[PDB]
Design a protein around this ligand. Structure first.
Ligand SMILES: CCCCCCCCCCCCCCCCCC(=O)OC[C@H](COP(=O)([O-])OCC(O)COP(=O)([O-])OC[C@@H](COC(=O)CCCCCCCCCCCCCCCCC)OC(=O)CCCCCCCCCCCCCCCCC)OC(=O)CCCCCCCCCCCCCCCCC
Ligand SMILES: CCCCCCCCCCCCCCCCCC(=O)OC[C@H](COP(=O)([O-])OCC(O)COP(=O)([O-])OC[C@@H](COC(=O)CCCCCCCCCCCCCCCCC)OC(=O)CCCCCCCCCCCCCCCCC)OC(=O)CCCCCCCCCCCCCCCCC
Ligand SMILES: CCCCCCCCCCCCCCCCC[C@@H](O)O[C@H](CO[C@H](O)CCCCCCCCCCCCCCC)COP(=O)(O)OCC[N+](C)(C)C
Ligand SMILES: CCCCCCCC/C=C\CCCCCCCC(=O)OC[C@H](COP(=O)(O)OCCN)OC(=O)CCCCCCC/C=C\CCCCCCCC
Ligand SMILES: CCCCCCCC/C=C\CCCCCCCC(=O)O[C@H](COC(=O)CCCCCCC/C=C/CCCCCCCC)COP(=O)(O)OCCN
Ligand SMILES: CCCCCCCCCCCC(=O)SCCNC(=O)CCNC(=O)[C@H](O)C(C)(C)COP(=O)(O)O
Lengths: 124, 88, 110, 52, 128, 67, 80, 98, 55, 55, 459, 178
C-alpha cells in the first residue's frame, strides 16, 4: 500500500516500524484508557482446544460457532449467524489494530514536529 | 478398439487420392505406375513435397535416403505396406 | 487440486488416444464439437484451475492469494506469486485455444 | 551416441554401434542414457549466461 | 548476417555448419570411399554369421574385446611415472584425505572443547 | 455404440455425449450463478474497509501539539 | 463397414482462407498447388467453430434459465 | 534417381517372402488347442477383514497401555458430561453487540 | 499385454502412498517415501524398451 | 492472463513470420536448465569416475 | 557346539563314500540339515554369552554369522554343480571337500574363545579358498589373483600374531572373557601405537580398507561362483568380527588412532561407489560395491558406539546375503553367454522375466530400500556417524546417491533396452537357478520381521 | 533405413534435405494450414530463385548461408512424428518384440497348442536350411576380390534361388508385435 511507499521512498523516520510498535506509552495522549476485556476464561479455551492463535479477544464467538457446528452436524448450512458474529468480532479487532497503527504514526509525526520546532525556536 | 487393420487397396486409394489433389498433376492421366519425372514432368522439389504430403497423410515420416527413390505411386504403396506390415 | 488436475490429465489422455497417440497441440485442431464431453470437462477443469469463483479451486486458491497479500512477507515473493497467477490463466488459454478452437490439424483418417 | 544417424541400420540399434567398428574409449559415458554432446539451437556459453 | 553459433565440448558443431563438408577435394572423396569400403567389409563379415542357420551362440566381436582389455588390463603396462601423472596422483589421491581430516578434526575439536565448557545443550541426548 | 472412421469428414456423434456435455456445462453455470446470488460477499467482501484519515485526533489520543 | 473415400472433386479452396492465400500469392506471381489437399479442414462439419469466450460460455443459457426458475421459486415460496 | 534394377528386384523378392511369412503368422480356427453369489465380494473383502481387525484391536492391541490413544473430546460451555453428570456453566453474558 | 501388471503396480503405489500419509513415526514415513519413489521408477519406465523412459 | 494470452494467440493467424525472441528461447528450452545441468555435472562426474578414481 | 562341528566333519566321509551320481544330493540335504540345527544358536541371553566349554562360546554377534555360513554351504553346492558337470568324480569330491573344510574352519573361527585359536582358524580359511580360486577358476589371471589374495592377507596377519603372543606374555591370557573383564587402558606411547597397528591392520586388510583393497576385485572376479559367494558373504566379515573383538583392548588409543582409517573409509566409499559407475565387467561392479559397503562397516566399528556396532552387525549380514545373490545372478548370464562384459547381453527382461524380477529385488536390497535390513544397518551407522560429527552426513548421503545410481544402472544395462540380435542361445531359466535366487532372497526379507536377531550383542 | 548409404551426399541431395528440413520447421513455426501454405510457397519461390545456377562454388556458398540461416532460425521444439527417433512413441513397442528363435525353446506342451503354426515353421526352417549354401555361393561369386564396396546386396538370379541374407529381414518380429 501507500504506507510502504511512504516508509521506503519517503522519510522512514516519520513512519511506524511494524516490528517495533507501539513505542509511545499507551496512556500518553489518552486521559483514561479502559483495559481491553476478555469474555472466555482460560479454562474454557483450554477445554475447547481452540488453537494458540485462535485464543484471541474473539474466542467466545469462535466457541459458540464450534458448538453450533457440532450440535447441528448433518446440516452444515446452519451455523451462519455464529460465523457472521465471529467474523464481525475479528473485523473489529483488525479495525482496532489499524487504529493503533494510525495513532502511533500520528503521534510520531507530532513528536517530530514538536521536538524539531521547539529546537527551531530554541536556536534563535 | 483402435484403427482397423490397413489393406493394400486402402493404401493405394489414399496415395492416389493425395496425388489427385496436387495441382501439377492431371487427375485423369495419373496412374499407379506413372513415373513422377518421365511421365508427369515433375522435378525433385515436387518429389520432396509429394513425400511430405504422404507423410502427413499416413502420420509417419519417410527417411530421406528411402524417400529419394520413390518415383511412382506403386513404389510409395509398396514402401508403406512393407513399413506397416501389410500383406493383403 | 487433486480433483481438477487428475481430470485435466484424463482429458488430455482421451484427446491423445483419439488422435492415434498424438501429444502435440500443433496437430490438434477443432475438437470443441468433435469431442464435446471432453471439451466440457477440460473447460470446467481449466476454470477450476484458474480460480473461477465458487468452484473447487476457488475456495483454496482465492484464500491463498489473500493470505499472501495480507501478511508480513517477502515483496519479491509476493510479486512472483501474482505473476505466476496470471501465467496460470495464460497457459490454460494456450491449451484450450490450440487444442479445441480453430480448424483441424490432424491426419485425415478421423 | 545420440549424435549418430538414427535412420542407419545399426547392428546394435539401441547402442547405434556396428559390429567390428572401433569403440570409443568413453562409450559407457556416451551411451545416450547418459552424457549428450548433441548440437543445441542456442550456443553453449550463451545458455550459461542466461541461466546464471 | 545472423548471430553465429559457436560449438563447445558438450554442445558440438553441427554437420551442416561444418566447413569441412563444403570444401571437397578428390582425396576427400577417395577417403570417404575407403571408409565406406571398410564399413561394408565389416558388415558383410557380420551378416554372414548373423544369417548362418548353423550358427548358435554369441558372435564374438574383437572390437568389444579390445575395448574392455584396453580399459582394464592394458593400462598399467603403458603407465609411466611422469611429473604430470605424479602431481595428478598425489593431488587426487591424497589431498581429499587431508582436507577431510582437517575438516573433521576442526569440527570435533570445537565440539569437544565446547563440551568441556559445559555449554552444548545435550539434554535428551541419551542415544548415540 | 459402434462408430466408424470417416476420412476427411466430421466424425459421427451420439446424442448421449452431447446431452451430457450440455447438462454438465449448464450445471456448472447454474451452480456459479446460484452461489453468487447467495454468497456474493465471498467475492466482494462483507465488511467495509475503514479510511484511517477519517479518524479524529480525540478518538486516537493525539494532543493538540502544545503539550 | 468398408467405407469409401469421398469424391475428390468436391474439395475446393473457394470461400475459405486458402482462397485468400491463393490470391495473395497470385499478387506476387506465385501459386499454391496443395490447397485442395487442405480444403477438407474447412469444408464441412469443421466449417464453423466457436470463439474463446463462446467456448467458456458453453452451457450458460440453460444454466441461467434454471437459475431464474430457482430464484423465482425462492421468491414465490417464502411468502407462505 | 530411383532404384537400380537389382535393388528393385531384390526388394520385390524380399517383399513376396515377407508377405508370405506374415500370412503364415495367422491362426487356423483351432490353434489354441487347450487341454482339459450376488454379494459374495463384500463379505469376503470387507466383512471378513473388518472382523479380524476389530477382534485384533479390541482384545489384543488394547490389552496394552497407550496403544490406542485418542485426543480428548472438545468441551464447550453448557455441555453435560456423560461420565459424571457434571454441567459446564455458560460463557459470561456477552455485551450483545447486535 | 501387461494390463494386469499395470493395475497391480497402480495398487502398489496407492498402498505405499497410504503408508506415507498415515505414518506416525519417521521410519514408517520413510518406508512410504521410498516405496512411492520405487513405484514411480517402475511406472515411468513402463515401456522399458524405450531409452528415454529408462533415462 | 486470459486477455493477454488470447490476444497473443489470435495474432498467430496473421500472415506474418518473424524469427523468435531470446526470451521465447529461454522459456521454451526450460531456462536452459536441463541443457546445462544434465550435461556438465554428469560429464564431469563420470569423467572423474573413470580417469581419476578407476585408472 | 560340537553338535554343529561333528556333523560338518561327517560331511567329508559321506561325500567321499557316496555314489558318483549322488554326491550333490547328499551334500545339499545334509548341509541344509546342519543349517537347521545351527539355527538353534539364535537363542541368546543378553547379559553374557553362551559358553559351551573352555574352547567354544557363542554370542549374539557370532550366532548370525554361523547361521549365514551354514546356510551358504547348500547354496554354493547348488550353484557349483552346473559348471562342474564335466568334471571327474574325484575332482568333484575334492571341490566339495574344499567347501566343507572352509565351512568347518569358519564355524570354528566364529566360536573360538581364545585369540590364538581364532587366529589359527582365521589363517586356515586361506588354504581352501586359494585352492578353489587357483584350481577351478576359468581364466589365466586366477593364478595372479591367488597370489594377491594370499600375500595381502599374510602381510597383515603376521604382525597380528606377534602382537597376540606379546599380549599373552604381559596379560597372561588370551581368553576373550578374561581379556574383556581384565581390560586396561592403553597409554599414549609409540610402542602402544605400533601394537595398535599390529592388532588392527590384519582385519583392515580383510575388510578390505580403501587403499588395501586391490586383492578383492582380482580374487572375486577370477574365482568360480562358490568361491565368490563365500569370499563376499562370509570371508570379508572375518575382518569385521575380528575388529569387534579386539577393540576392547585398544581404548582409549582408538580415540585418535582411528582418524586416518575413518578418512580412508569415507573418501574411499565415495571413490568405490564412483568406480562402479564406469565398469565394463559385471562381477567387478559387484566387488567394488562390496568394498563400499565394507567401508561403511569400518566407519561403524571405528567410532565405537552401541548404535554403530548394531548397524555394523546388521549391515554385515544383509550385505552377505545381497552380494551372494548378485554374484549368482551375474553367473547365470555368464553361463548363458560366456562373457562378463555388461553390455554384451541386453534386454534380458524380454527373454527371462522371472530372472528379471530376481535382478530387480537384488538391486533394491543393494541400494537399501526400507524396511530391508540393509537400510536398517546403514541408517544406524549413519545416525551414529552424525552423532560423531554432523558433517559426516555430507559424505554418507553422497554415498547413498551414488549407490542407487550404479545399482539401477546395472539393472538398466542388463535387463532393459532391446535384446542383442546375434545372441540366440539364451535358454529359459532352470528350476535350480530360480530356487537358488529364492533361497537367497526370502531369508533376507524374513529377517525384516525379527531384526533384533541380527542386531548383535549391543541390542 | 532400408537403403544402403553411399560414401557421400551429392550437392543435389544436400539441397533437397535442406529443403525438407526448412519446410518442416516452417510448419512447426506456422501452426495453421493456410499460413503454412502461404509461407511454404514463399520458401519454394526463394528456393527456385537459384535452381539454375551454374557456378558450383556460388551454389555451394549459397547452400552454406542457407544452412546458417536455418540453424539460427530453426524451431527449438519442432514437430516430430510420434514414432520418429525423437518422437513420444519412438521405441515404445520394442519390449514386445521377441526374436523367432525363442520359439525353439518352448516346452513340447506349449507346442502342442498351435500345431499348424509349428508345421509351417518347420517348413520355413527347411527352406532356410536348403537355401543357405546357394546364398553363400552367390555372394562369393558376385563380390569383387577387394571385398565389397557398399552394403548393397544382390537379388536372386536363378529359377529357384532366394536373395542372399534374407532370413532376418523376412522374419522381423513386427511393428506392433503384441
Ligand atoms: C504484458 C505481456 C508481455 C509479453 C507480450 C509481448 O510483447 O509478446 C511479444 C514477445 C514474445 O516473443 P516472440 O518472439 O514474439 O515469441 C515467438 C512466438 O510468440 C511463438 O508463438 P507461441 O505459439 O509459442 O505463443 C507465444 C506464447 C509465449 O509468448 C512468448 O514467447 C513470451 C515468453 C515470455 C513472456 C511472458 C511474460 C511473463 C514474464 C515473467 C517474468 C518474471 C520475472 C523474471 C525475471 C528474469 C530476469 C532476466 O504466448 C502465450 O502463450 C502467452 C504469453 C504471456 C501472456 C500473458 C502474460 C501475463 C503474465 C505477465 C503479466 C502479469 C500481469 C499482472 C501483474 C501482476 C502483478 C502486478 O514478448 C517479449 O518480447 C517481451 C519479453 C520481456 C518481458 C519482461 C521479462 C521480465 C524480466 C526482463 C528483464 C528485467 C531485468 C533487467 C535486465 C537484467 C538486469 C540485471
Ligand atoms: C506393500 C503391499 C502389501 C501387500 C500384502 C501382501 C504381500 C505379499 C508379498 C510377499 C513377498 C514377495 C516375495 C518376494 C519375491 C517375489 C516372488 C515372485 O517371483 O513373484 C512372482 C509372482 C507370480 O507372478 P507371474 O505373473 O507368474 O510372473 C512374475 C514376473 O516375474 C514379473 O513379476 P512383476 O514384474 O509383477 O514383479 C513381481 C513383484 C515382486 O518383486 C518385488 O520386488 C517384491 C519384493 C519387495 C521389495 C524387496 C526389497 C526391498 C526392501 C523391502 C523389504 C520388505 C520386507 C517386509 C517383510 C517381508 C516378509 C517376507 O515386483 C513388483 O510387483 C514391484 C515391486 C515394488 C514393491 C515396492 C515395495 C516398497 C515397500 C512396500 C511396503 C513394505 C513394508 C510394508 C509395511 C510398512 C508399514 C505398513 O508375482 C507376484 O505374485 C507379485 C509379488 C507380490 C508383490 C509384492 C509387493 C509388496 C510386498 C513387499 C513385502 C510384503 C510385506 C508383507 C507385510 C504386510 C504388508
Ligand atoms: C594404503 C592405505 C594403508 C593403510 C594406512 C594406515 C594409516 C596408519 C597411520 C597412523 C596414524 C597416526 C600414527 C601415530 C599417531 C601420531 C603420529 C605423528 O605424526 O603425530 C605427532 C608425532 O610427532 C612427530 O610427528 C613424530 C612423527 C613423525 C615421524 C614418522 C614419519 C611420518 C611420515 C609419513 C610416513 C607414511 C606412513 C604410511 C606408510 C605406508 C604428534 O606429536 P606428539 O604429540 O608430540 O607425539 C605423540 C607420540 N608420543 C605421545 C608417543 C610422544
Ligand atoms: C549433496 C549432493 C548434491 C548434488 C550435487 C550434484 C550431483 C551430481 C550427480 C552426478 C551424477 C552423474 C551420473 C549420472 C548418470 C548420467 C545420467 O544420469 O544421464 C543424464 C540424464 C539424461 O539427460 P536428460 O536431459 O534427462 O535426457 C536427455 C536424453 N535425450 O540426465 C540426468 O538425469 C542428470 C541429473 C543430474 C542432476 C544434477 C543437478 C542437480 C543439483 C541440484 C542442486 C540444487 C538443490 C536444490 C536445493 C533446494 C533447496 C531446498
Ligand atoms: C596389507 C599390509 C599391512 C601391513 C601391516 C604392517 C603394520 C603392522 C604393525 C606393526 C608390526 C610390528 C609391531 C610389533 C607388535 C607390537 C607389540 C609391542 O607392543 O611391541 C612394542 C615394540 O614395538 C616395535 O618395536 C615395533 C616397531 C616397528 C618394527 C618394524 C617396522 C616396520 C615398519 C613400521 C611401520 C609399518 C607399520 C604400520 C603399517 C600400516 C599398514 C600399511 C613394545 O614392546 P617393548 O619392546 O617391550 O617396549 C615396551 C616399552 N615401550
Ligand atoms: C523456417 C526455419 C528455418 C528456415 C531457413 C532456411 C533458409 C533457406 C533459404 C533458401 C535456400 C536456397 O537458396 S538453396 C541454394 C542451392 N543452389 C542450387 O541448388 C543450384 C543448382 N541446382 C541444383 O542443384 C538442382 O537444380 C536442385 C535445386 C537441387 C533441384 O534439383 P531436381 O529438380 O533434380 O530436384
Amino acid at each position: 500500500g501507500a504506507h510502504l511507499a511512504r516508509r521506503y521512498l519517503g522519510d522512514a523516520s516519520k513512519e511506524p516500524d511494524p516490528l517495533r510498535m507501539p513505542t509511545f506509552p499507551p496512556d500518553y495522549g489518552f486521559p483514561e484508557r479502559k483495559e481491553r476485556e476478555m469474555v472466555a476464561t482460560q479454562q474454557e479455551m483450554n477445554d475447547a482446544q481452540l488453537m494458540l492463535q485462535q485464543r484471541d479477544y474473539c474466542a467466545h464467538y469462535l466457541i459458540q460457532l464450534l458448538k453450533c457446528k457440532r450440535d447441528s452436524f448433518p446440516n452444515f448450512l446452519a451455523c451462519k449467524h455464529e460465523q457472521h458474529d465471529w467474523d464481525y468480532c475479528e473485523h473489529l479487532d483488525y479495525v482496532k489494530r489499524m487504529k493503533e497503527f494510525e495513532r502511533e504514526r500520528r503521534l510520531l509525526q507530532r513528536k517530530k514536529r514538536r521536538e524539531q520546532r521547539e529546537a527551531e525556536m530554541a536556536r534563535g | 478398439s483402435d484403427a482397423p487393420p490397413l489393406t493394400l487397396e486402402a493404401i493405394k486409394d489414399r496415395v492416389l487420392y493425395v496425388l489427385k489433389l496436387y495441382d501439377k498433376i492431371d487427375p485423369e492421366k495419373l496412374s499407379v505406375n506413372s513415373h513422377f519425372m518421365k511421365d508427369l514432368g515433375l522435378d525433385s522439389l515436387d518429389q520432396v513435397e509429394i513425400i511430405m504430403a504422404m507423410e502427413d497423410e499416413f502420420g509417419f515420416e519417410i527417411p530421406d535416403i528411402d524417400a529419394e527413390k520413390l518415383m511412382c505411386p506403386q513404389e510409395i504403396v509398396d514402401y508403406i505396406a512393407d513399413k506397416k506390415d501389410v500383406y493383403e | 487440486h487433486a480433483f481438477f488436475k487428475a481430470m485435466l490429465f484424463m482429458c488430455s489422455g482421451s484427446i491423445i488416444h483419439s488422435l492415434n497417440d498424438e501429444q502435440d497441440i500443433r496437430k490438434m485442431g477443432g475438437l470443441y464439437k468433435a469431442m464435446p464431453f471432453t471439451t466440457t470437462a477440460l473447460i470446467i477443469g481449466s476454470l477450476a484451475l484458474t480460480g473461477m469463483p465458487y468452484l473447487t479451486g476457488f475456495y483454496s486458491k482465492d484464500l491463498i492469494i489473500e493470505a499472501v497479500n495480507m501478511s508480513y512477507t517477502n515483496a519479491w515473493a509476493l510479486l512472483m506469486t501474482l505473476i505466476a497467477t496470471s501465467l496460470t490463466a495464460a497457459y490454460s488459454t494456450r491449451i484450450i485455444f490450440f487444442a479445441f478452437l480453430g480448424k483441424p490439424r490432424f491426419p485425415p483418417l478421423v | 551416441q545420440q549424435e549418430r544417424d538414427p535412420w542407419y541400420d545399426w547392428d546394435h540399434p539401441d547402442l547405434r554401434l556396428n559390429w567390428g567398428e572401433p569403440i570409443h574409449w568413453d562409450l559407457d559415458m556416451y551411451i545416450r542414457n547418459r552424457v549428450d554432446t548433441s548440437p543445441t539451437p542456442v550456443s553453449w556459453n550463451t545458455m550459461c549466461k542466461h541461466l546464471f | 548476417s545472423f548471430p553465429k553459433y559457436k560449438p563447445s565440448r558438450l554442445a558440438t558443431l553441427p554437420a551442416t555448419l561444418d566447413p569441412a563438408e563444403y570444401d571437397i577435394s578428390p582425396e576427400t572423396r577417395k577417403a570417404q570411399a575407403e571408409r565406406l569400403a571398410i564399413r561394408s567389409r565389416l558388415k558383410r563379415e557380420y551378416l554372414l554369421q548373423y544369417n548362418d542357420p548353423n550358427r548358435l551362440g554369441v558372435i564374438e566381436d574383437p572390437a568389444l574385446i579390445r575395448w574392455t582389455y584396453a580399459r582394464s588390463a592394458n593400462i598399467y603396462p603403458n603407465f609411466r611415472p611422469t611429473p604430470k601423472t605424479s602431481l595428478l596422483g598425489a593431488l587426487f589421491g591424497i589431498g581429499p584425505l587431508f582436507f577431510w581430516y582437517y575438516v573433521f578434526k576442526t569440527d570435533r575439536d570445537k565440539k569437544e572443547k565446547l563440551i568441556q565448557e559445559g555449554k552444548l545443550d545435550q539434554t535428551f541426548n541419551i542415544s548415540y | 455404440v459402434h462408430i466408424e472412421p470417416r476420412y476427411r469428414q466430421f466424425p459421427q456423434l451420439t446424442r448421449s455425449q452431447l446431452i451430457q456435455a450440455e447438462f454438465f456445462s449448464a450445471t456448472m453455470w447454474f451452480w456459479i450463478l446460484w452461489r453468487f446470488w447467495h454468497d456474493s460477499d465471498a467475492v466482494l467482501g462483507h465488511f467495509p474497509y475503514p479510511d484511517p484519515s477519517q479518524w479524529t485526533d480525540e478518538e486516537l489520543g493525539i494532543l493538540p501539539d502544545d503539550e | 463397414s468398408k467405407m469409401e473415400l469421398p469424391d475428390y472433386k468436391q474439395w475446393k479452396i473457394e470461400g475459405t482462407p486458402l482462397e485468400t492465400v491463393q490470391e495473395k500469392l497470385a499478387a506476387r506471381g506465385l501459386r499454391d498447388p496443395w490447397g485442395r489437399n487442405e480444403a477438407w479442414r474447412y469444408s464441412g462439419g469443421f466449417a464453423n467453430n466457436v470463439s474463446f469466450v463462446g467456448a467458456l460460455l458453453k452451457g450458460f443459457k440453460w444454466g441461467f434459465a434454471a437459475f431464474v426458475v430457482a430464484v423465482g421459486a425462492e421468491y414465490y415460496l417464502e411468502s407462505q | 534417381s530411383g532404384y537400380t534394377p537389382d535393388e528393385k528386384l531384390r526388394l520385390q523378392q524380399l517383399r513376396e517372402l515377407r508377405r508370405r511369412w506374415l500370412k503364415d503368422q495367422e491362426l487356423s480356427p483351432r490353434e489354441p488347442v487347450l487341454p482339459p453369489r450376488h454379494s459374495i465380494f463384500a463379505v469376503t473383502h470387507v466383512l471378513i477383514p473388518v472382523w479380524i481387525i476389530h477382534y485384533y484391536l479390541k482384545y489384543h492391541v488394547t490389552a496394552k497401555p497407550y496403544t490406542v490413544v485418542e485426543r480428548k473430546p472438545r468441551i464447550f460451555p453448557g455441555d453435560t458430561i456423560l461420565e459424571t453428570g457434571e454441567v459446564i456453566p455458560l460463557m459470561k453474558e456477552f455485551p450483545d453487540q447486535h | 499385454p501387461f494390463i494386469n501388471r499395470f493395475f497391480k503396480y497402480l495398487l502398489l503405489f496407492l498402498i505405499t502412498m497410504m503408508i506415507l500419509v498415515t505414518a506416525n513415526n519417521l521410519f514408517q514415513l520413510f518406508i512410504g517415501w521410498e516405496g512411492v519413489g520405487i513405484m514411480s521408477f517402475l511406472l515411468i519406465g513402463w515401456w522399458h524398451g524405450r531409452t528415454d523412459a529408462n533415462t | 492472463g486470459f486477455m493477454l494470452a488470447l490476444e497473443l494467440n489470435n495474432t498467430t493467424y496473421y500472415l506474418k513470420f518473424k524469427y523468435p525472441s531470446q526470451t521465447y528461447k529461454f522459456s521454451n528450452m526450460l531456462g536452459y536448465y536441463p541443457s546445462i545441468m544434465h550435461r556438465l555435472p554428469t560429464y564431469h562426474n563420470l569423467s572423474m569416475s573413470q580417469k581419476s578414481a578407476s585408472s | 557346539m560340537l553338535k554343529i562341528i561333528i556333523p560338518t566333519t561327517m560331511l567329508l566321509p559321506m561325500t567321499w563314500m557316496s555314489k558318483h551320481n549322488m554326491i550333490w544330493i547328499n551334500a545339499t540335504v545334509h548341509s541344509l540339515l546342519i543349517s537347521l540345527i545351527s539355527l538353534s544358536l539364535l537363542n541368546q541371553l543378553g547379559e553374557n554369552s553362551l559358553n559351551f566349554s573352555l574352547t567354544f562360546f557363542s554370542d549374539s554377534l557370532s550366532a548370525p554369522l554361523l547361521v549365514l555360513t551354514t546356510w551358504l554351504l547348500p547354496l554354493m553346492l547348488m550353484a557349483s554343480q552346473s559348471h562342474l558337470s564335466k568334471e571327474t568324480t574325484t575332482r568333484k569330491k575334492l571341490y566339495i571337500t574344499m567347501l566343507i573344510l572352509l565351512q568347518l574352519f569358519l564355524i570354528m573361527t566364529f566360536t573360538a574363545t581364545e585369540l590364538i585359536l581364532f587366529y589359527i582358524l582365521f589363517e586356515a580359511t586361506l588354504v581352501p579358498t586359494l585352492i578353489i580360486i587357483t584350481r577351478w577358476g576359468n581364466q589365466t589371471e586366477r593364478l595372479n589373483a591367488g597370489l594377491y589374495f594370499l600375500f595381502y592377507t599374510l602381510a597383515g596377519s603376521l604382525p597380528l600374531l606377534v602382537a597376540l603372543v606379546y599380549i599373552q606374555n604381559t596379560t597372561g591370557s588370551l581368553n576373550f572373557l578374561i581379556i574383556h573383564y581384565w581390560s586396561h587402558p592403553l597409554s599414549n606411547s609409540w610402542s602402544n601405537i605400533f601394537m595398535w597397528l599390529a592388532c588392527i591392520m590384519a582385519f583392515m586388510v580383510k575388510m578390505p580398507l580403501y587403499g588395501l583393497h586391490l586383492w578383492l576385485p582380482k580374487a572375486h572376479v577370477e574365482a568360480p561362483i562358490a568361491g565368490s559367494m563365500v569370499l563376499a558373504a562370509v570371508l570379508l566379515k572375518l575382518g569385521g568380527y575380528g575388529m569387534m573383538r579386539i577393540t576392547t583392548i585398544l581404548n582409549p588409543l582408538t580415540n585418535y588412532m582411528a582418524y586416518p582409517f575413518l578418512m580412508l573409509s569415507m573418501w574411499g566409499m565415495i571413490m568405490t561407489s564412483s568406480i562402479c559407475l564406469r565398469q565394463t565387467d559385471l562381477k567387478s561392479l559387484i566387488a567394488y560395491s562390496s568394498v563400499s559397503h565394507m567401508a561403511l562397516v569400518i566407519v561403524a566399528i571405528m567410532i565405537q558406539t552401541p548404535w554403530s556396532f548394531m548397524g555394523a552387525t546388521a549391515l554385515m549380514i544383509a550385505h552377505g546375503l545381497t552380494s551372494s545373490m548378485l554374484f549368482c545372478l551375474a553367473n547365470t548370464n555368464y553361463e548363458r553367454v560366456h562373457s562378463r562384459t555388461m553390455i554384451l547381453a541386453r534386454g534380458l527382461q524380454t527373454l527371462l522375466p522371472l530372472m528379471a524380477t530376481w535382478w530387480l529385488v537384488a538391486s533394491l536390497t543393494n541400494l537399501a530400500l526400507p524396511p530391508s535390513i540393509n537400510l536398517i544397518g546403514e541408517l544406524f551407522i549413519i545416525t551414529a556417524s552424525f552423532s560423531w560429527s554432523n558433517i559426516t552426513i555430507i559424505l554418507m548421503g553422497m554415498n547413498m546417491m551414488i549407490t542407487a545410481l550404479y545399482s539401477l544402472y546395472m539393472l538398466i544395462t542388463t535387463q532393459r533396452g532391446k535384446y542383442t540380435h546375434h545372441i540366440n542361445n539364451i535358454k529359459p531359466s532352470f528350476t535350480r537357478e530360480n530356487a537358488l535366487m529364492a533361497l537367497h532372497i526370502l531369508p533376507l526379507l524374513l529377517l525384516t520381521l525379527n531384526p533384533k536377531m541380527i542386531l548383535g550383542p549391543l541390542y | 533405413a532400408f537403403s544402403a548409404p553411399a560414401a557421400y551426399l551429392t550437392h543435389q541431395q544436400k539441397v533437397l534435405r535442406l529443403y525438407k528440413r526448412a519446410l518442416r520447421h516452417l510448419e512447426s513455426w506456422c501452426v495453421h494450414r493456410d499460413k503454412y501454405r502461404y509461407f511454404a510457397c514463399l520458401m519454394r519461390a526463394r528456393f527456385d530463385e537459384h535452381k539454375n545456377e551454374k557456378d558450383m562454388v556460388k551454389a555451394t556458398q549459397l547452400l552454406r548461408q542457407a544452412e546458417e540461416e536455418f540453424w539460427y532460425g530453426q524451431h527449438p521444439q519442432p514437430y516430430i512424428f510420434p514414432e520418429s527417433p525423437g518422437g513420444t512413441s519412438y521405441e515404445r513397442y520394442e519390449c514386445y518384440k521377441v526374436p523367432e528363435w525363442c520359439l525353439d525353446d518352448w516346452h513340447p506342451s506349449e507346442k502342442a497348442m498351435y500345431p499348424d503354426y509349428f508345421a509351417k515353421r518347420e517348413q520355413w526352417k527347411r527352406l532356410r536350411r536348403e537355401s543357405w549354401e546357394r546364398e553363400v555361393k552367390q555372394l562369393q561369386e558376385e563380390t569383387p576380390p577387394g571385398g565389397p564396396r557398399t552394403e548393397a546386396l544382390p537379388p536372386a538370379r536363378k529359377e529357384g534361388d532366394l536373395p542372399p541374407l534374407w532370413w532376418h529381414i523376412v522374419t522381423r518380429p513386427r511393428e506392433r508385435p503384441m
